[PDB]
């Protein structure tokens, strides 16, 4: 699956953030509230399993990782939903004022500006810490999608408080914390 692409588990749709690697093996990271629901993930609702969960953390954080088990070696890119893709080649933390994009499977690519970093967000399940607030529009099914700027991976889509027009509220989990948690790098 490419970054921003749909993934299905537990009868729900989420989105993948980025393809990552360690030890010559391929994995994708996504939202923890998505990997909490299921161990097996497919690229269509009743499709064959492409990967199995190897870790998850939600609430407190919101990230998780799925190991590919179907023998594929996907490109390390994010789907721009227009026939093309964005190559990702590094990861960093977002900064206030930075223009970002997110790609997820419900609203495809939307854009916004980072308004705050290191934010605690209270969801119904509990608080998630050290989050990033943006003005990018989003909707259910977009969690786990890629927050990025050019070839730089910045975050994993977690949630929002709504959107009207272009004025969104997409919140992301910093991707660097998930990459260190699992000892993985983007490629």
């Amino acid at each position: 699956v490419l970054g921003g692409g749909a993934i299905y588990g537990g009868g729900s749709r989420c989105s993948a953030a980025f393809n990552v690697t360690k030890g010559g093996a391929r994995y994708f990271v996504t939202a923890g509230h998505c990997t909490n629901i299921s161990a097996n993930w497919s690229a269509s609702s009743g499709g064959s399993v492409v990967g199995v969960r190897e870790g998850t953390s939600f609430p407190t954080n919101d990230y998780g990782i799925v190991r590919y088990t179907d023998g594929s070696s996907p490109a390390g890119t994010v789907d721009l939903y227009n026939g093309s893709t964005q190559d990702i080649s590094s990861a960093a933390n977002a900064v206030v004022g930075q223009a970002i994009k997110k790609s997820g499977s419900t609203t495809k690519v939307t854009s916004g500006t980072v308004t705050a970093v290191n934010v605690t967000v209270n969801y119904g399940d509990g608080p998630v810490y050290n989050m990033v607030r943006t003005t990018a529009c989003s909707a259910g099914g977009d969690s786990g999608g890629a927050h990025f700027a050019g070839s730089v991976a910045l975050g994993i889509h977690s949630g929002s408080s709504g959107c009207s027009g272009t004025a969104g509220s997409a919140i992301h989990q910093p991707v660097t914390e998930a990459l260190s948690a699992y000892g993985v790098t983007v490629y």
């Binding site: 977690s158 929002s160 408080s161 509220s169």
Partner: peptide, 4 residues
């Protein structure tokens, strides 16, 4: 805010 809600998870999406």
């Amino acid at each position: 805010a809600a998870p999406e």
